[PDB]
PDB file of C-alpha atoms and ligand atoms in Angstrom:
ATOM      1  CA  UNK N   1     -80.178 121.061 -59.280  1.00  0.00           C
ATOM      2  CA  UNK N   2     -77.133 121.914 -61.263  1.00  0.00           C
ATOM      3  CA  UNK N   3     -75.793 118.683 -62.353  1.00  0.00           C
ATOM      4  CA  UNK N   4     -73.031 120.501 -64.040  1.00  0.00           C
ATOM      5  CA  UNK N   5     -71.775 124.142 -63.432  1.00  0.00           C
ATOM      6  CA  UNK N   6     -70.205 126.033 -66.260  1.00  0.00           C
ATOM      7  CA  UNK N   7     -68.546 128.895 -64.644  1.00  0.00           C
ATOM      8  CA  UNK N   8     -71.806 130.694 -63.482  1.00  0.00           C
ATOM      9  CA  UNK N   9     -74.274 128.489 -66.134  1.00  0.00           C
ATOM     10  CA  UNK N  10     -75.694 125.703 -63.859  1.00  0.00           C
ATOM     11  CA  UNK N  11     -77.290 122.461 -66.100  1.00  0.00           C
ATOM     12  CA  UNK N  12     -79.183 119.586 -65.272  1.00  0.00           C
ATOM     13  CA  UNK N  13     -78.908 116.216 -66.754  1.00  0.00           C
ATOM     14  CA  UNK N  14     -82.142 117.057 -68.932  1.00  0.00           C
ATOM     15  CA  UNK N  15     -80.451 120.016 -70.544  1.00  0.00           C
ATOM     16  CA  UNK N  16     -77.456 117.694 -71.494  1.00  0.00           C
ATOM     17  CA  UNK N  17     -79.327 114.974 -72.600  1.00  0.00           C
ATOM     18  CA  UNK N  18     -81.307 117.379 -74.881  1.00  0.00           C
ATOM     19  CA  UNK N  19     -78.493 118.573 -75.973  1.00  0.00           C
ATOM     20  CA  UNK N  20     -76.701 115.714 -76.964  1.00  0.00           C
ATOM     21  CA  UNK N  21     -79.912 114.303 -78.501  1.00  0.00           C
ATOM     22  CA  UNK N  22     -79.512 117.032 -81.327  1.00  0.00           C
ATOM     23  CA  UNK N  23     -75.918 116.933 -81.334  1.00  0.00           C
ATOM     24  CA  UNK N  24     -75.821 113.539 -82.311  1.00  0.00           C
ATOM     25  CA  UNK N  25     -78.602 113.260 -84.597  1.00  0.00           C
ATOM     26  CA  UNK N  26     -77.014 116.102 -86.493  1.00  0.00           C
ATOM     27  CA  UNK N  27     -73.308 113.794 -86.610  1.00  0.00           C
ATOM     28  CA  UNK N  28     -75.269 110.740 -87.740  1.00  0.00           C
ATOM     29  CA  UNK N  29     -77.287 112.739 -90.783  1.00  0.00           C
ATOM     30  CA  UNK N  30     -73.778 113.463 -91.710  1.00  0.00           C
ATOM     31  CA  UNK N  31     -74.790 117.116 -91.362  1.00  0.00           C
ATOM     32  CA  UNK N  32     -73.523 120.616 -89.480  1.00  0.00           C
ATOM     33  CA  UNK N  33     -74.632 123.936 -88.879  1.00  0.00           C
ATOM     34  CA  UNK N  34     -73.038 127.226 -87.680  1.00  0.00           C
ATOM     35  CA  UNK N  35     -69.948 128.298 -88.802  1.00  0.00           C
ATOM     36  CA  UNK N  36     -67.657 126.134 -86.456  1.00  0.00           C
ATOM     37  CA  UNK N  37     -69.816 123.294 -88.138  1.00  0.00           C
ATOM     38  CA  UNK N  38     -70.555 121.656 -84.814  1.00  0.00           C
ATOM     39  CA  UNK N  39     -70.584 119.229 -84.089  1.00  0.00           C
ATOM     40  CA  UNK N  40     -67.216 118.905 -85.046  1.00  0.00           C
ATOM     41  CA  UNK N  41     -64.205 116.498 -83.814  1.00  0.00           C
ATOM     42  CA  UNK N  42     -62.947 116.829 -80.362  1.00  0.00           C
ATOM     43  CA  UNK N  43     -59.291 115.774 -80.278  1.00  0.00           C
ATOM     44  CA  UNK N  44     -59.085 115.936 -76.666  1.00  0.00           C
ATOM     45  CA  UNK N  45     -55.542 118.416 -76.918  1.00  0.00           C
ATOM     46  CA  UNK N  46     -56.498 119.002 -72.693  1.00  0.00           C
ATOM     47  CA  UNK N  47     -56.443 114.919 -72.103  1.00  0.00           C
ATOM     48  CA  UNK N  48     -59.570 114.748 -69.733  1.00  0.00           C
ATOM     49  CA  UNK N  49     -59.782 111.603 -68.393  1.00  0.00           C
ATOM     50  CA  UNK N  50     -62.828 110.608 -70.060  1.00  0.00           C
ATOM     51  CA  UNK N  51     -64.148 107.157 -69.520  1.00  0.00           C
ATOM     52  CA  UNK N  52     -66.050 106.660 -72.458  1.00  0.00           C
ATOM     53  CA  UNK N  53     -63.675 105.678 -76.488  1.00  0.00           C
ATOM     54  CA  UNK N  54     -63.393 108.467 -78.340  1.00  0.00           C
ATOM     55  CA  UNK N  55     -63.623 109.320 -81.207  1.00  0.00           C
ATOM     56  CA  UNK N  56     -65.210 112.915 -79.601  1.00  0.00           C
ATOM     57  CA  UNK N  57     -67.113 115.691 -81.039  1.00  0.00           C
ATOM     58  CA  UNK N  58     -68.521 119.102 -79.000  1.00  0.00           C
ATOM     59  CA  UNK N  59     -71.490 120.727 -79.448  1.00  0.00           C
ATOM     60  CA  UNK N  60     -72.966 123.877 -78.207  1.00  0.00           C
ATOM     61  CA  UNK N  61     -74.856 123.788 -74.865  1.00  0.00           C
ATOM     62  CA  UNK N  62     -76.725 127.027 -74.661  1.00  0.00           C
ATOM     63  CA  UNK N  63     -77.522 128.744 -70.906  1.00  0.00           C
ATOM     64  CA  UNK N  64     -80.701 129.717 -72.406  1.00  0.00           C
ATOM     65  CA  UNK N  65     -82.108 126.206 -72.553  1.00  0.00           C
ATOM     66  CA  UNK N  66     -82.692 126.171 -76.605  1.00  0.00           C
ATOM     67  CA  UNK N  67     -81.352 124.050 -78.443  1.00  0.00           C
ATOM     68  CA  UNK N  68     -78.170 125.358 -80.810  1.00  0.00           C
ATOM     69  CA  UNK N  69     -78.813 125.755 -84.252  1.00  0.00           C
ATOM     70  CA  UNK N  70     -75.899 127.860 -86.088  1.00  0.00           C
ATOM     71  CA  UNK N  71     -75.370 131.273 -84.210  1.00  0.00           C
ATOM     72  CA  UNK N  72     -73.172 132.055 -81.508  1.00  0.00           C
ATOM     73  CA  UNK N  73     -71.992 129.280 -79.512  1.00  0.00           C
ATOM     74  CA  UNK N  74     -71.233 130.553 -76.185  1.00  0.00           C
ATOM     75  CA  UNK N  75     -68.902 129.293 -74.489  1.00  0.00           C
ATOM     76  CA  UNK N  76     -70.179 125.500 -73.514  1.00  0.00           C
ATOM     77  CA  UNK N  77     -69.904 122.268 -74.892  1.00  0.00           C
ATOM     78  CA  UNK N  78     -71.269 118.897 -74.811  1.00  0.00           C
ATOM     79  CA  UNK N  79     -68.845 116.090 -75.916  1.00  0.00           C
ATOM     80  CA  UNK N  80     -70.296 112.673 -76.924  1.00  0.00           C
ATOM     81  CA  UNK N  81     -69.027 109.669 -78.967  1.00  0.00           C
ATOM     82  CA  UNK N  82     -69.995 107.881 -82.085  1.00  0.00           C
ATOM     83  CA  UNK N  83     -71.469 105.200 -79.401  1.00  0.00           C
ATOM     84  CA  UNK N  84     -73.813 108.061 -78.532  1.00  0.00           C
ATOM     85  CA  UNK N  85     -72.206 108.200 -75.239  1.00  0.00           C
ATOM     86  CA  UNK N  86     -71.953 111.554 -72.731  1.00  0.00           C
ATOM     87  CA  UNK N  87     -67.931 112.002 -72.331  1.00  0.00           C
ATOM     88  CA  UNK N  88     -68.638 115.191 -70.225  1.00  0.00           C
ATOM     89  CA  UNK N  89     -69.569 118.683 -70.030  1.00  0.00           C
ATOM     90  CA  UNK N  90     -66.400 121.568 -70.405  1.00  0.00           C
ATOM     91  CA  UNK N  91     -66.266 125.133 -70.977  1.00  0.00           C
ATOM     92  CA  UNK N  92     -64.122 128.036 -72.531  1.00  0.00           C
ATOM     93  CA  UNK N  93     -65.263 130.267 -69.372  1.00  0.00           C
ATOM     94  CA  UNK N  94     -62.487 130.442 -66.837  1.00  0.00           C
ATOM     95  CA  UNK N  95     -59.678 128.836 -69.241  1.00  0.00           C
ATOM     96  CA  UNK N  96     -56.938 130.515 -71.350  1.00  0.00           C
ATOM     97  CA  UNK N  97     -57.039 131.343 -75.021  1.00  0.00           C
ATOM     98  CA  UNK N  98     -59.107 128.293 -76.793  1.00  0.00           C
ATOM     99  CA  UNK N  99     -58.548 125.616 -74.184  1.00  0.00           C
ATOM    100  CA  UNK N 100     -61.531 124.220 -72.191  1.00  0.00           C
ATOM    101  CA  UNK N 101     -61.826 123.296 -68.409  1.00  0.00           C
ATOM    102  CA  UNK N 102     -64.314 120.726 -67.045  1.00  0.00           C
ATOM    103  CA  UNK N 103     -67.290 121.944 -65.509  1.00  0.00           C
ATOM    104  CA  UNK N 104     -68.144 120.791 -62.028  1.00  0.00           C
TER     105      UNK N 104
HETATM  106  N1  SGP U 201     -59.342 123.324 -77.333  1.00  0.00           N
HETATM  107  C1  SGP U 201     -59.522 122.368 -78.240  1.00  0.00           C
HETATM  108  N2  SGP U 201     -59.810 122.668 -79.503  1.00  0.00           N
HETATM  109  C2  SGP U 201     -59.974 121.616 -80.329  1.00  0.00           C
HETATM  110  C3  SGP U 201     -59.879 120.298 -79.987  1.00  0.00           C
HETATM  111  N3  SGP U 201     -60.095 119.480 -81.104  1.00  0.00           N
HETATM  112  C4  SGP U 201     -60.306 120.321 -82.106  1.00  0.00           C
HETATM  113  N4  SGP U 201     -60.239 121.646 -81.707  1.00  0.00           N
HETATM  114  C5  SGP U 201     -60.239 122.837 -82.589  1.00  0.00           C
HETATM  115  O1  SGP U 201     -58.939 123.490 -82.468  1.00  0.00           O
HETATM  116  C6  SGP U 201     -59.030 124.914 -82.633  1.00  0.00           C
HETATM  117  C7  SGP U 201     -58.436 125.572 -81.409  1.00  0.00           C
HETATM  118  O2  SGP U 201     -59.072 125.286 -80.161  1.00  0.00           O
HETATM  119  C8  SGP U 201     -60.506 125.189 -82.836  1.00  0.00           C
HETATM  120  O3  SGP U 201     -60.832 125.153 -84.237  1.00  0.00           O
HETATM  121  P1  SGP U 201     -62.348 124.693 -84.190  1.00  0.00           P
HETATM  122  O4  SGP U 201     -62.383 123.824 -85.384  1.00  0.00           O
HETATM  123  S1  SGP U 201     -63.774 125.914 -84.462  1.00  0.00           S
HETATM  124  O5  SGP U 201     -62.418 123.591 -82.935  1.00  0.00           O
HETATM  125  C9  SGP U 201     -61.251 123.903 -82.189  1.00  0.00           C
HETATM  126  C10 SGP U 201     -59.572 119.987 -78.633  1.00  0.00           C
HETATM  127  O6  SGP U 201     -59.445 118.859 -78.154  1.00  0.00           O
HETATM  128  N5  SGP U 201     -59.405 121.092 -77.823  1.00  0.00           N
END
């Protein structure tokens, strides 16, 4: 079921969670990888709502189901917390220049 939709890429809560997994093991080693360096800080310029403390940090949510590990990015993102909390799910597809939308 898609959990989350991402412009046309559909995610369940698996995917996420996967992601976020790596994300946040990669924050807590203190280490990065791509050029970005994800995951990096997420200063929340749009102001979602989320309900979770910040501070945020994206990381790369690939359509293909692997898990990022330093090439393109695409265009979604998984933001968590340094409580190793989900914030949500938001995408560059469908938004202007580098701002991000919410995916559904
Ligand atoms: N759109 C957006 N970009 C952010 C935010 N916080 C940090 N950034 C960075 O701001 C720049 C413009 O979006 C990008 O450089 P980058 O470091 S690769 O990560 C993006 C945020 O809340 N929103």
């Amino acid at each position: 079921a898609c959990d989350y939709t991402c412009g046309s890429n559909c995610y369940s809560s698996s995917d996420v969670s996967t992601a976020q997994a790596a994300g946040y093991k990669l924050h807590e080693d203190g280490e990065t990888v791509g050029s970005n360096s994800y995951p990096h800080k997420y200063n929340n310029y749009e102001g979602f709502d989320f309900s979770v403390s910040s501070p945020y940090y994206e990381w790369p949510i690939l359509s293909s189901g692997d898990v990022y590990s330093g090439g393109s990015p695409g265009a979604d993102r998984v933001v968590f917390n340094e409580n190793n909390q989900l914030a949500g799910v938001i995408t560059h597809t469908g938004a202007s220049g580098n701002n991000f939308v919410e995916c559904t």
